[PDB]
Structures are given as structure tokens and as C-alpha cells.
Amino acid sequence: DRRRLLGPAAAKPMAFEQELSLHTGFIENCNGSALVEARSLGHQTSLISAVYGPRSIRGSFTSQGTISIQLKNGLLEKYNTNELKEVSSFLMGIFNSVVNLSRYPKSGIDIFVYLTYDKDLTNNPSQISSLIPHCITSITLALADAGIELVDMAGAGEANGTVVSFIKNGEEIVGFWKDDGDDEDLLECLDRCKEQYNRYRDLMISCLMNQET
Amino acid sequence: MSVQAEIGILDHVDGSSEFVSQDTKVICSVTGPIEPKARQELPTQLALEIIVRPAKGVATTREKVLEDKLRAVLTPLITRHCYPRQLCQITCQILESGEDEAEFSLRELSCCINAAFLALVDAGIALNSMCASIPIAIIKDTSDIIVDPTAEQLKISLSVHTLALEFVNGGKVVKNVLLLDSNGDFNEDQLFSLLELGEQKCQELVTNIRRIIQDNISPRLV
Amino acid sequence: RRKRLADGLSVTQKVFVRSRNGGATKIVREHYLRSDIPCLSRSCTKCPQIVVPDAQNELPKFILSDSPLELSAPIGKHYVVLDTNVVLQAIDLLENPNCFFDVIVPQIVLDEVRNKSYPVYTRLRTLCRDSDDHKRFIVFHNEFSEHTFVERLPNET
Amino acid sequence: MSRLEIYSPEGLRLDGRRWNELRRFESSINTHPHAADGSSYMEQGNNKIITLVKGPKEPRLKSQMDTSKALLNVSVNITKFSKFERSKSSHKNERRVLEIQTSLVRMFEKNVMLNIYPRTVIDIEIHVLEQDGGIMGSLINGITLALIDAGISMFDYISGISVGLYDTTPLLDTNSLEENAMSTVTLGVVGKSEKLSLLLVEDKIPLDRLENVLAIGIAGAHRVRDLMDEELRKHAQKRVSNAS
Amino acid sequence: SEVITITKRNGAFQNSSQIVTPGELVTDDPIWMRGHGTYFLDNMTYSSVAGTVSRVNRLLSVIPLKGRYAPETGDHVVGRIAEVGNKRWKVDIGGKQHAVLMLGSVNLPGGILRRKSESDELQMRSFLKEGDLLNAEVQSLFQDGSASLHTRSLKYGKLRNGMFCQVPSSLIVRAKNHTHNLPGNITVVLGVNGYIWLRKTSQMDLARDTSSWQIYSDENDPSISNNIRQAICRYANVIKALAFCEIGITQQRIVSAYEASMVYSNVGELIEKNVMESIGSDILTAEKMRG
Amino acid sequence: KDIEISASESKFILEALRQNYRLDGRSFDQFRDVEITFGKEFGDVSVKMGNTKVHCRISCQIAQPYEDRPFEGLFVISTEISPMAGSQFENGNITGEDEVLCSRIIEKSVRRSGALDVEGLCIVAGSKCWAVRADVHFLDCDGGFIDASCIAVMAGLMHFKKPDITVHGEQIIVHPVNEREPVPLGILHIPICVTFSFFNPQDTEENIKGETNSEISIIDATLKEELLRDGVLTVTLNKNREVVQVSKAGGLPMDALTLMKCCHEAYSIIEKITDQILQLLKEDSEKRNKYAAMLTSE
Amino acid sequence: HMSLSVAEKSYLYDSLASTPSIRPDGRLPHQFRPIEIFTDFLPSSNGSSRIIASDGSECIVSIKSKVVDHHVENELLQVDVDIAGQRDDALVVETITSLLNKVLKSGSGVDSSKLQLTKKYSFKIFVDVLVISSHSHPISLISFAIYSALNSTYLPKLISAFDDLEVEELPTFHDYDMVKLDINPPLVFILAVVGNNMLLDPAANESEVANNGLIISWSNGKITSPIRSVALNDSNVKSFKPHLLKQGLAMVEKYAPDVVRSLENL
Ligand SMILES: [Zn+2]
């Protein structure tokens, strides 16, 4: 590779109570940033969301804004690039309802979400589904911190691999992610994630009030 | 300091040169001022496109550093405000390392600086002053300061240095130190003894360089 | 399946399984079924008209004698068709001047011999090539025909 | 494990064909009306090629626009399932493929005046569904048919052919096995002429052979050209009958 | 076929006057004037395309069987803006190149009363914006063949109160008028380029058979009945049906098909192949015994 | 960046070709003399054709062969263009029409043709193999890049020597040039590349049907002649009386007879070039040691 | 994909968002558009299909097999998605690729037992997708083609013994003879949400004005994962009431067997 330093190509790689921590506006490189850390049981997730915009696009005739989201692997190389694109497409399907696009004509908002770490403990005699509500939490904070107009606070929850995002105080849905798990958990997951949403919502609102103060 | 250089060897370039020190042979070409790409454009100054090609293999991150250091030398040399919104392509093709490229890039960098300067002179581009670069090294036991070291001397060195100075007033006044790239560890007494002896041999080189420039170019003029 | 073409030519699919270095590769080459395969016998009347000369000029002789070795009935005059096994074992006897005078070697046999043992294949080819007034060797391309081509029946080795 | 030869003394090849037989040719026009201005589905042997001609139309970028001639682009998509053994990587960036694309462009730049569609773009998309020797010749025939279907003006047909050589005599229209066995020559022929748009030799070829091999190919290409005219005219007769 | 109609087929990629062939020679009379579809060398005249030989006076040409639609001067076309630049729009019509419009070729709100402004050229997006549909007449032609459009009429302008659909341009020919009133209180706009606009009949159309500030409004008629909407859908499907059978679309054909399609209760029944084929076939046979 | 040529130049050079004249004062079948200079190191070769200057460098390193080919070594040819040969070339433009063609011509002439014995590049089967690399540097351009490169690659490969190796299974000590002499790379044949440029007369009058203006064809065109040509043809021939490869993509349509004539003309050139290349290899091989006879064992 | 003016989109919304929902065409909220399917046209492959939509949308699926060690090869079914004239990298491509691989996992919506040859070796199935043309989200289009292809796939038959632990025989396959791949391919349905109405098989113009969308998988006569909400466009995306989500799942649950029945014909 003439672009980076990959080293020797003839070598081989190595072969072997909900708690939240919110911080926003710690990056001076962009318009809005957010830090989300969650620890449950033996599993914990820390990711960083960076927002750049809204910046004008030359020659653009779009009467509304344009959102672009990209997830990155900060440290541990676990999630496939194909899967990162899928979540990104899911995330954009959410905030296009959340973000007031009519406010930014001929403009574009780029959103970078760095998944620096996730720690997984598995006992021996999906996976990215659990990180999704934290990505939504981070972006919604980073957008609100940046000054981007949001119609409502976007939040979500993960129940047995079933992720569902809520706005307007859980009355409606802005996103739905179901993988594997079990059937007939429709009513249950909708109620369990709604509790996680309301919990994540109040902490998100309090976060802005704290830092803003 | 028995270097040898030729000027104006390439046909399809505004300016070119071929600098040779010991083994180390580098050929350089310069085209400009010309129309720049949009991403290269500078509203008020000249844009420099600097390319370094290795003697073996393709250009890697190693040559990317050679391009960067060569940029630090050539940038203040050129009167860039004379060419706003314009481009100057500077390409260096290292033909022979003259050193173990797996360990050192000392002689190749100095030879590229001297060749690039000569190519800029040939191309007729506005320069604020003159310039010369030499490689220097220090021995493991003797700790002597050897100017223009051989490849064999580099193997047994404790530190390697690239020195490029900016000269004015007929090559007698050091305007500034364009680049000093010291890798290794140092003692103050050795440094100034190096700079004192180094300045002498540099001044002798300019005098030789002036001779070469006049001898080749004068037959062309009337 | 099997497709019929304009020339009266047919075409099918030859599928074989190849094992190399613990690997498994499916190899298929189209298999054309001809209708102009000569018996290469002097006695034959039907075949000779069918045969076609090369663009470079040439005429093809018929090897198999019209009066082969006659044996006690009910064999009488006869041609000999060989199996794969009798060839691998029997090559020396197949070169013996005192037996096997008019022999027909099927294409499928010639192919199997080539893969199993190249030197024997060369010796078999050479005898046909070196046709003298003593011993005659012939080769028939059965696979390039349709009258004789058979396909694997369900549950058949 | 097996072994095989090239040309038997009986004048028979590995697949059963003789030295001078063209494979089964099927041709098909207007296969993708809702996807392109012109389209063709080629079946030359086991080779299966979809060809789409999109244009002449507005360039997507005004930077890439010629005011004197149309911009001609060709992208060949050799699918990962074209061969018996599925290729793990994509073949799109492969230097062999870039040369093929470049070669085809050079060929047809001289065959279409390309002076009557200024400030437009002609995009040619190709999908190779199945491959079995002589894929270059089949690519040529697919583009020629599709371009004509699009009503895009051109001076003449360009027919492509594959040549196989053993010993003294070459074999017309080579498959993958023969291609593997022996060197082949790919010929681009313009109309009914003796003029070559494309001459492609990638393997070693005795110098004595080529003059005679060329003679065989040109004669065979003429037959191919005649078939193509029949293929389109016949389709038109069939289409008219369907209308009636 | 209660929910989805899936036609299947196995073992196949797909299913199913002098003759003209490539390299063919049309004539050897040097007196001829060679037109489109041909090329010549001395006395010999050859064909460049696949089509029928045409002889008009001394002008020999070959009419292609297929190809792009061509703009003639004076055609009534319907186009959708592609780009806005400078003091002009480039409007997709469906040809080789985008349609050309000049700020001086359109009519401002308030008209004659209105005074010339140099801010119009900087605010063209307030009149025509990318994606907008409109009626237009091919005013002039450029050297290459491109068309310059104009909407200097009440008949022409931005389109609304309806739905868009398109058929091959070969199925729509030039006529005295391309805007037609049909039963069901709907109006069709049959662009020569193949672009068709079906809308609720306005007062303008009614007047022909017998506000200048809002000629570029994206707003539709706030009161459009379901009976008109369901009529539009039906007219759309029958037009697609005529197009499916290579039948030339004419006002008579459309209304005839629209009333003939009434046999089928649900409008969605008109999307099936056998229904489309029969409807078109019934029209041809109807014209047979009526002619 | 598009080069600008005066209408006057385009009319002058075209008319001169009809009068059998050219700017550099050459013939139509004549090829500019090729100068070959070897550096101190093996594999260092400089080819010069008039103003055209190319430099090739052959290098090799221990590597592992592909799974598909456990008996064959690795061999690659690099021909990346740079603005040094002229501002017409974009830095790193390896997808341009002319670039990909040139890259493919060389590859089909040397790599595909099997000019280099890759089987002799294997040290231990399926484990360690030599990886020969040919790096072509286009120093400056006055046309004939393909011809310059083929000469440069082949002269380099025939020049080149690879450190002697003693192999005992999976352990191999690569003797240095100090310890023992290096070993020359194997060659099967010597491919040479010829470039032909085609032109149109654009003249009103032809004297006879029997004898006609026909087609313009010159050999090894300069930079100014390369921009005005209507056709490109590259034929590769050797001293073995065989066609290595020939590449004609579109351009001015030509008869099969005309191509053969160019092919036969090129054969006389590749013969002179091959012998000359061998000679300069012979002169440089004997050149290297002032005392080699004093040195010898056998 | 499709470009529409503000006026046209509003009219479409009025037509479709109406309480008695009307398709611009005239379809019912559960009616699909007619499609054509060709199978077994690639002899070089183990299975193949070609689906043509009414709007010219065309997709080609190929099925190839390879003997692998299931102890080292976790995924026994790999889906590959492509489009000529389109870069591989694109967000849409990888998303559909990731999605489809989950739909056809080894132990989720596919009987991977039918791929097992011996104790140690099994058949790896490569499902290559080629989308020639498409004017909307082709996820359901591809799904129908993959289904058809997997139901007409024929794999080589094993001859050697099936116990590599003891005797350890090299995998050999009898010539000519082949066994049809008996498997139950899942289906992927896509829905459109316009106001409070849910539409099966959204057209191009319909998707442009839709408020939201649903991607619902179907296997073994029941709803299964992956289930994904999806923005069919990006200018009119709005949140939806939970009852709509339950309506969509119910809608698929009753109309899917009809689709499968029309699709199960050999
Ligand atoms: Zn007989």
C-alpha cells in the first residue's frame, strides 16, 4: 500500500443497573460534538459523535438540508464495513424526520460517529444492535449542541435484539430495527424500549441544561 | 565536495538539471509558471507541486517526507508573490541512492535540494536568493564530523544531518538556515566546529558552482 | 438436455468432477455429437462419401482390411474391439506380428489410455500410424458421433 | 485427474468439432427497452452477454463535455460467476480489463464518425453473464448490435472473431479448453472488408501461420456478418408477423 | 394470482419491398441526393442504419426502425426542467440534449402591466425550479438540432392539478392541437415528445371548447374529487395499454379505450398484460368494422 | 490540460508527410538510433531515442509465490508517468487511455510472452520465491515511449544479476556480492516493440488508379507527429522469426496486407536492435572487471 | 430515483393518503405489479433466475457451490450484490448486502442441514445478485429472484463415505448425477407508509411521497427477522404510530402465502 504503512504483507494478525455518562461540546474542530458512555453488567460502550454543519453546497438547488452519517471503528476492528453502512442508512432514516430540513436550503449536514470502543464479555460452556440506541443518543445530543433544529428529541432502546426509536414522548416511532431474537415480543419490546427512551430523553435534556448553564 | 552537475538536459520541461554527489545521482525537472488545478490554486501566491521518485520501487510514505522537507527549502526561495493563482511543477527522479535506502535518505535529500534549485534556475523562476545543501554525519568511535559522507561511513555513524543554507551577496552572506535535519544525538562543541568547517567548504562549493554556471551558460549568450 | 443444430449436429454437456490438492472443482466442456464418423473399413460403402478432405489437399485411406483374419465359426472373418484393461496389460501382445491384424480402437479407449498411461498411448498411436502390409491399426472417434453415444443412466457407476 | 489433446489425426477436437466450425450463434435486439436506448443479448456458444447503449444524452458533468463530438464510454462487467470457478475478487480495476475497455474504444472511435452528436454522451454498459472462450469477439458483436438498435449512426458493421492454432492449421472459434491448449488470435473486421479494426495476439504465434490464419478468420467473419444481417432482418419479419 | 402474478420459464434467459442488411447497397444512381440513414462513394449509395428505404422526389434516405425522438420547428412539447443556470433553464424533453430556454422567452406575472427588472435573471428559480413540469412550444432550433423553447402564451406554462406519464414519442404525432378534453372532467396534454400530462379540466380548456400572479404556484386545486382522481388513474392505464400494443395515441383512441375499459370494475385490473393486449386489440378491430 | 497546436503546424506537417518529409529529417521506415547506457549496479539501464529518455531499474527480493503457482516466482512491471516527461501527463494517472494501452503493450510483450523464466525464480517450491521488479522511469518525452520501455525492460533484465542462493529446505543463506558472484536472470526470448503512426493525405488529386495515395505510415513518430496521427499500431517481433504481440485498437482502418508489410519492416529493425543490445551487454560484461582473467578458476 | 415537481407529489399524496386509498395506477393496498421470472438459464452455475418488473426493473441471480470445512467456515451462505454502471462501495449496495446476508443466514432462515456433506465438509452457497435496472428499493425484487433461483438449484452428489473423523476419505462426487437443493428460501417484503395507509409493493412515484417504509422478512409461513423500518425518500420522512407497525406485520402475514403460492410453482 502506497497510501499508508500496512507493514509486512507476509505476516498475520493476532490469533487467540443502567449507567450513563454524557458530555457535549468538547471538540472545537466542528460545530457540535457529543460523548456517550454506557455501562451495564459486564458490557460497556463508549462512542464519540462529531457534527460538521450546516455548510453551504455550491450550485445546490435543494430546498431542504442533506444529512450524511458515517460510523467508524475507533479501536477494536469488529463490525463489518458493510454493516456500518446499514446502520448509517438506518440512522439517516431517523434524523430526516427529526431534523427540521426546511431550515437549511442549499445546505448539507455531515455527521461522523466514532465507535472508539465497545467491550463484550461472553461466557463459554445481534451484536451491534445494543449500540444503536447509544448512537441515536449521541447524534441527537451533537445536533442539538451544534444548533441544528430538531422537531423532537430522538431516543431509542434495545430489547432482545429489537431496537425501536421514539419521538413525541413515545407516542410515535422514527425507527425500527429487529434482528433474530424471538417472536411475539412486539408488545413487550415496544414497552421496554419506551422506558429506555424516556430515561435517555430526560438525561439528554438535562445534559444540555448542565453544559449550557 | 567534488560534485558534478548539468543544466538543461530535458526538452519537454521549462527547466531541468542533473546533480551528482559521489554515487548519489538525482535528475530534476521544473515546469512553471503554468495553469493550476482548482484545488491547487492560491489567490495571491504560487502553488508548488513537489514530487519525489525513488531509485527502486514505487513512491511510498518515505518519499512523502522527502517531498515535505524539500518543500520547506524551496518555498521561501521562490518569489511566489510574482505568480498569483499559478502553478510550478517540481519533479525529482532519484536515479541512484548512493546510500543504503533501507537505513538512510540523507544524501538523496541534499542532492534533491541542489538539483531542484538548479532546475529552478534553469527554468527562469523568480528566486529571492541562492541555496546549497550538504549531508553530514558523525562517527561511532572517532566522533569526527564528516562532510559529504560515503555510504560506508553512514553505516558506522551515530548521527546523520542535512544542512541547507540560504545565501545572498555573491554567496558570502548566510541569509538564513532553510533546513537542518538532525537525526541522532548531539554535543554543542562538535556542532559549532561542524558549522565552522562546514561554512568554509560550502563557500568553496559556491565558488565552484559559479564557475560551472558561467562556463556552460556564457557560450549561449552574446 | 440435448440440442439439435442445423448441420444435423448435436450438442450436450460433459460434466466431470476434479479433485486436486484436497480441492473440488466442477469442470464442464460442451460435447458435440457428430453424424459423420467413418468406420474406417475397406468393406464399407456408406462411409467414404461422408468424409471430407482438409483445406490443405489430402485423401484418407481406409485401413481395415476387407478380408480380415478368418477364424472358426461362428466368428468367421472378424474385427477386434478392445477393452481398457486388455490394452493396459496387453500392449506387448498388441504389437506381436503374429496376432491382432485388424483392430478398432474407440476414442473413449484412446482417451482413457492417454490419461492412465501416456507411454502406452504413444505405442498404441504409433501402430496405427505405422500401417504396413503386415499389421493394420485403426482409431474410431465414437464420442464425436451420435449413433453410439450413451449417457449415464440414473444410479449407474 | 485427467489429460487431453488438441487435434486428433481423425481431424477431431476435444469438444468434437472439426477444424472449421463456428459455434451456435443466437442474436437478440431490443431486449431492454426500459433500461436503454439500444440493447442486445448475445449468445455465441456458451457465452452470454447483455449490452446496453444509453444515449446520446446530456453529460452528468459539464466539465466532461465536447462541443465537436459525443463522448463514448464503455464499461465491461465480467461477473464473478462467468466462469466455472467463481472469482473471489472483482475484475473491474484489473489492468487486463482496462486494456480491453481501451482497445474496444479505440476500435469504434474510427467506426462511428461521432461528429454528429456534439455536446452529448454515449454510455455503453456490458454485462458478461457466462464465458467460454472468444469473449472479446463476442463483446464486439454485442456492441455493434446494441448501437444499431439505438439508432446511432455508424459507417459499417464490426464483427469479432476468435482464432485457434495447432501445428500447421488454426481452429476457428476457440473455446476455453482450446484457448488454454493453444495460442489464439482475436480479429476485428469492418463490414465485408479486409480491414481490421482490432488485431489482438497475446500468446506466441509462429510467423508463417498468421497470413493463412487471417485468411480463415476473415472468411469466417464474413459468414458471421451475414448471419447478423439475417438475425435482425429475420426478427423484423417475425415481429411484423406478430403485429399481423 | 390473487396477490401477485408471477410468470415463469425454465432453461432460457428469455422468451419469444426490398430487404435491407448491413453492408447492403441501396442504389447505384449518382443522380440521387443522399439523405439521412445513408452514405455514398461515387455512384454507390449505402445504408447506415437498419430501416426502410425512402424516396421523396430526388432525395434518397433510409428511415430507421428505431431511434431518438427529433424536435421539429413548431412542435408542441411537454418538458421537465433539468437545470437552472444563468438566464435560462435546461428542460428535459426526452431527446439527445436538454431543451433550451431564454429568460426573454417566458411571460412574467402581471404581464404587460409588469416592468422589466434586472433581478429576474437572478431569481429564475422562483419561476421555473428543478423538477417542475410545463407546456412549451419549440420556438427555434440550434445548429446541432437542439431546441429553444418558449411559453409566451396562456396555453403554455407550469403544469399542476394532475399526474405525469410517458409513452414512446413514436406513438404520438403532430396535429392541429395536442390539448384535449375528455369525459370525466379531465384534460390530457399529449406532448409530441411522448411526455403526457393528465389533469383536472380547467376553465381554459372549457373556453377553448366553446390569476396571472399564480401561474407558477406549486399549489394544486384544493377541491379535486375522487371521481376525477380515479378517472385520471383509468386514463393513465389505458394510455399505457395503448403504448404496450404499439398503438398510436390519439384523442379518439384514448376516450374509446377509457369507455371500453369500463368492463373491468377495479381500475387496477388494467395493468395486467392480457387486459392491455385485448383493449388495444378491441380498438383496432373496432376501427376495422367502422372504417 | 490540453496541449495547443497551431492550425498552421497541423497543415505543415501533414503536407510534409505527403512529400515524404518530416521535421527530424528521417524516413518512413527508419527508426531513430537507440543508445543504451548501463549504470554501476546490475539492472540499471538508460535508453535514449533522440530526445526521448527512459530509465529502467531491475530489482528483486525474497517473497512467497501465489498458491496457484507454487513453482513460479513473481514478476511485475511498473510504468507510472510523471510531469517530468511533460506537463501533459498527470502525476499518477494510471487509468488514462494512452497510459493503460502502453501498460498493456509492455505487459503482453514481456510478462505474458514469458520473456523471463519465472520458473527459475523459484527457490523452494510453494514457500520462497524471488520477486523480480522492472521499474520504468519516463524521464522526458519526445515520443516513442512504448518502444523505449520495451528496450529498457529487456536490456535491464538481461543486464540484471540476482544474489547467489544456497538452499537447504526452508533455510537459505543469500550470499552477498562480496562472498560470491551474483546470478543472471533467465531469458527465453528477446521481444522488441515497434510503434507505427498512420496519416491521411487530404489531397485533391491522385495520378493513377493503379498507383494511389493510399495511407501514410511512419515508424517511431516524434511528439509533434504523435498528436497528428489518425492511427496507432504496435507490433512486437524478435530474432526468432515470430510475432510476440501486436496491438491495433480502432484508428484508421487498414488492410491485412499493409499490417504484414509493417510487420516485415519491423522485423528488420528488431534484428538490428537485438544484436546491438546483446553487443552492449557484451561490452559491459567485459567492462566490469579490470582484472577478471587474473581472477578466473576454470 | 424519480424526479417529481412539488405539485405532482402533493397530488400523489392526496390520491394515496386518502382513506379509501387509490393507487395512481388504481391498485389495491395489497396488490403487486405483474412480474416475469426466468430460471435455469445459466448451465455454468448450480442455479439461476431473472426477474423483470413492470417498470423495466431487472435483476439476475446466480447460485454457485463450493466444498468447505464447516469447522472453519462459519457462514455457509454468502450473498453478493452488484450493479453495472454503479460503484460497489455505495451505501445502498452494502446495506442491501448486509441485510440479505442476515435474511439468508445459516441458522436463521435457511435449513443449513441440506448443505452438509460429511462430518467435516459442507456446501458453501454463493448467491450472486446483479441488478441491471431499478427505480425503487430493489430489496423485494432481489428477494423474489433469490427465492426462484434457490428453488431450482442442483448440487453435485457425494460418493465417498461420510465419516472423516475415522477413515478420513477425500470428498469424491459421482459423475453426472446431481441432487436438487431442497431448501426453504425466505422472502423480503417492502411496504410504504403514506399517512395512515400501508401499501404493498411501492411504486417509484409512491415511494417518493411516502412518510416511511418497512422491510419485513418472511419464512416458514411466519414473520421473521430482519425487520427494518426504512426511509424510501429523505425529504418527507416522518415518525409513525406503533399501530401502523403492527398493521404492516399483519398485512404481510395474510398476503404473503398468496405471493408464495404464485411463486412456488416449479
Ligand atoms: Zn461404415
Distance CA E190, CA E242 (A): 14
Cα of C148 vs centre of ligand 1, distance in Å, is 13
- Are the C-beta atoms of F65 and F118 separated by less than 8 Å? no
Q: How would you classify residue B93: left for phi > 0, otherwise alpha for psi between -120 and 50, otherwise beta?
A: beta
The helix (H) or strand (E) run that includes residue A204 is: helix A186-212
Domain membership of residue B74 as a residue range: 1-222
The grid cell for F149 is: 520501455
CA E221: distance to chain centroid?
Answer: 24
- Domain E17-69: assigned CATH number: 2.40.50.100
Please list every residue in chain A whose beta carbon sits closer than 8 Å to the beta carbon of residue G101: 82
Give the closest of G66, G172, G176 to C19, CB-based.
G172
E103, with CB counted inside 10 A (0-12, 13-18, 19+), is middle
Q: For residue E218, which of E81, E116, E117 has the smallest C-alpha distance?
A: E81
Residue with the three cell numbers 521549462: B14
Distance CA F225, CA F142 (A): 10
Chain D residues with at least one Cβ partner in E under 8 Å: 28, 30-31, 37-38, 41, 43, 48, 55-58, 117-120, 129, 148-157, 191-192, 225, 228-230, 232-233, 236, 243
* Residue D116 near chain F (CB below 8 Å): no
What is the nearest CA distance from G4 to chain E, expressed in angstroms?
A: 5
Q: How would you classify residue A148: left for phi > 0, otherwise alpha for psi between -120 and 50, otherwise beta?
A: beta
Distance CA E260, CA A36 (A): 65
Domain membership of residue G9 as a residue range: 1-266
Give the closest of D46, D50, D80 to G80, CB-based.
D80
Cα of C47 vs centre of ligand 1, distance in Å, is 5
Residue F46, SS3 per DSSP: strand
Distance CA F183, CA F132 (A): 13
Share in percent of chain E as helix, strand, coil (round to 5): 25, 30, 45
* Residue A14 near chain B (CB below 8 Å): no
What is the nearest CA distance from F90 to chain D, expressed in angstroms?
A: 17
- In chain E, domain spans: 17-69, 70-204+215-291
Beta-carbon separation of D110 and F100 below 8 A: no
* Residue A5 near chain B (CB below 8 Å): yes
Please list every residue in chain B whose beta carbon sits closer than 8 Å to the beta carbon of residue A58: none
- Are the C-beta atoms of E87 and E103 separated by less than 8 Å? yes
* Residue E81 near chain A (CB below 8 Å): no
* Residue C122 near chain G (CB below 8 Å): no
Q: How many domains are there within chain F?
A: 1
Distance CA D239, CA D228 (A): 16
Beta-carbon separation of G239 and A172 below 8 A: yes
Beta-carbon separation of G175 and C152 below 8 A: yes
Q: For residue G240, which of G251, G250, G230 has the smallest C-alpha distance?
A: G230
Share in percent of chain D as helix, strand, coil (round to 5): 30, 30, 40
Q: Which residues contact A176 (CB under 8 A, 6 or more apart)?
A: A163, A164, A165, G214, G227, G228, G229, G245
Q: How many domains are there within chain G?
A: 1
Give the closest of C23, C26, C152 to G156, CB-based.
C26
Beta-carbon separation of F243 and D95 below 8 A: no
Beta-carbon separation of D35 and G85 below 8 A: no
Q: How would you classify residue B111: left for phi > 0, otherwise alpha for psi between -120 and 50, otherwise beta?
A: alpha
The grid cell for D107 is: 476500435
Q: What is the DSSP letter of B21?
A: E
Q: What is the DSSP letter of B164?
A: E
Beta-carbon separation of G94 and A178 below 8 A: no
Distance CA E199, CA E160 (A): 7
- Class of the CATH-defined domain A1-211: alpha beta
What is the nearest CA distance from G42 to chain D, expressed in angstroms?
A: 7
SS3 string, chain G, reads CCCCCHHHHHHHHHHHHCCCCCCCCCCCCCCCCCEEEEECCCCCCCEEEEEECCCCCEEEEEEEEEEEECCCCCCCEEEEEECCCCCCCCHHHHHHHHHHHHHCCCCCCCCHHHHECCCCEEEEEEEEEEEEECCCCCHHHHHHHHHHHHCCCEEEEECCCCCCCCCCCCCCEEEEEEEECCCCCCEEEEEEEECCEEEECCCHHHHHHCCEEEEEEEECCEEEEEEEECCCCCCCCCCECHHHHHHHHHHHHHHHHHHHHHHCCC
Q: What is the experimental resolution, given in Å to one decimal place?
A: 4.6
Q: Which of residues 81-110 of G touch A (CB under 8 A)?
A: 91-92, 94-95, 97-99, 101-102, 108
G145-165: burial string, b at 16+ Cβ within 10 Å, e else: bbbbbbbbbebbebebeeebe
* Residue E209 near chain G (CB below 8 Å): no
- Are the C-beta atoms of G257 and G187 separated by less than 8 Å? no
Give the closest of G108, G231, G246 to A186, CB-based.
G246
The grid cell for A35 is: 460523548
* Residue D97 near chain G (CB below 8 Å): no
G223 pairs with which residues across the strands? Answer: G218
- Are the C-beta atoms of B50 and B112 separated by less than 8 Å? no
Residues found in chain C:
157
What is the nearest CA distance from G18 to chain E, expressed in angstroms?
A: 9
CATH number of the domain that G34 lies in? 3.30.230.70
Domain membership of residue F173 as a residue range: 5-298
Q: How would you classify residue D92: left for phi > 0, otherwise alpha for psi between -120 and 50, otherwise beta?
A: alpha
The grid cell for F19 is: 512529400
F46 pairs with which residues across the strands? Answer: F37, F55
* Residue F48 near chain B (CB below 8 Å): no
Work out the widest C-alpha separation in chain F, in whole angstroms.
76
Give the closest of F97, F248, F257 to D199, CB-based.
F248
Distance CA A79, CA A115 (A): 10
Distance CA B198, CA B212 (A): 21
Distances (CA, A) of B99 to B25, B102, B153, B163, F43: 11, 9, 10, 17, 17
Give the closest of B58, B59, B61 to A5, CB-based.
B61
CATH number of the domain that B77 lies in? 3.30.230.70
Amino acid at position G259, single letter: V
- Domains plus CATH for chain D? 1-242 (3.30.230.70)
Q: For D38, which residue in chain E has the nearest alpha carbon?
A: E67
- Are the C-beta atoms of G222 and A183 separated by less than 8 Å? yes
| H helix and E strand count, chain F | 6, 14
Question: In this complex, does chain D touch chain G, defined as having at least 3 beta-carbon pairs under 8 Å apart?
Answer: yes
The helix (H) or strand (E) run that includes residue D169 is: strand D169-172
Q: How many domains are there within chain B?
A: 1
Q: For residue E37, which of E63, E65, E57, E66 has the smallest C-alpha distance?
A: E63
Question: In this complex, does chain F touch chain G, defined as having at least 3 beta-carbon pairs under 8 Å apart?
Answer: no
Cα of E244 vs centre of ligand 1, distance in Å, is 57
- Are the C-beta atoms of G155 and G181 separated by less than 8 Å? yes
- Are the C-beta atoms of E205 and E181 separated by less than 8 Å? yes
